[PDB]
């Protein structure tokens, strides 16, 4: 997250922190995700497409810090790693960038809701907030495009939804953006998601309910003029989520 503010998991208790174990034993951060039911975390296919083996991954819930334990956190193996069969990558602009992780502890359990672990509601089909709506994004991604390190403490910020009409302009992203994607940015371009925020939640208040409107997917750079963040439009994938969460 470029700009915005530090936070803790109590302010985003569906946030899932996803790591990969290497040959070696060394564990590195991959991407964010969102708990949508006790046994299911939703994230982005691009986070996993090059290493699709479920055994490589560790998921934490209730975690506020990147490389230190948070009191009350839960650790999970990935029982199933489900990528979208129609995933496609340009040089930028991923299509169908959505993935499901079925989570299971060493003791064979799913998430147990607590003060630090809660699910996020899915939107109604084709039901998104109007352009200009303020939404929040959360993650452990870079604080500056030029940084080498990820922040140790979770961050969040606020970005405004951009219409497909505005985002499809040549001087924005042209044909790279589809109606299955949502653009969001700061009016001064001063705050944004960035590398390592992928897979995490774009949350909007819709009819008074906190709703997973988007999943961090792609963008050109971070906090750049006329280059919004691009998010998987969750409200266009409800049948895919409905079917694959029965696996």
């Amino acid at each position: 997250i470029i700009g915005g503010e530090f936070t803790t998991i109590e302010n985003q208790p569906w946030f899932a922190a996803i790591y990969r174990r290497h040959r070696g034993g060394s564990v590195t951060y991959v991407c964010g995700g969102s708990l949508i039911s006790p046994c299911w975390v939703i994230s982005a296919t691009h986070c996993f497409i090059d290493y699709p083996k479920k055994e490589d991954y560790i998921v934490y819930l209730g975690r506020s810090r990147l490389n230190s334990n948070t009191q009350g956190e839960m650790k999970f193996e990935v029982e199933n790693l489900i990528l979208h069969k129609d995933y496609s990558a340009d040089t930028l602009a991923h299509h169908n960038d959505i993935a499901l992780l079925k989570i299971r502890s060493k003791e064979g359990r799913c998430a147990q809701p607590s003060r630090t672990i809660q699910t996020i509601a899915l939107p109604s089909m084709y039901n998104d907030p109007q352009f200009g709506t303020s939404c929040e994004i959360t993650g452990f991604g870079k604080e500056q495009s030029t940084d080498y390190l990820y922040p140790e403490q979770l961050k969040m910020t606020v970005v405004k939804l951009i219409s497909h009409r505005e985002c499809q302009q040549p001087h924005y992203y042209g044909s790279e953006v589809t109606t299955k994607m949502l653009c969001a940015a700061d009016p001064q371009w001063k705050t944004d998601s960035c590398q390592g925020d992928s897979g995490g939640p774009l949350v909007c208040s819709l009819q008074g309910r906190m709703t997973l409107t988007g999943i961090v997917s792609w963008g050109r750079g971070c906090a750049l003029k006329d280059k919004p963040g691009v998010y998987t439009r969750v409200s266009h994938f409800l049948p895919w989520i409905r079917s694959h969460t029965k696996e």
Binding site: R20, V30, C31, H46, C47, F48, I49, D50, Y51, A89, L92, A93, H94, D97, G141, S145, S193, C194, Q195, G196, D197, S198, G199, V216, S217, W218, G219, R220, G221, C222, G229, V230
Partner: peptide, 12 residues
Amino acid sequence: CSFRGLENHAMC
């Protein structure tokens, strides 16, 4: 490789 979209990619 410094952008959102290319996390955990072999070529990076």
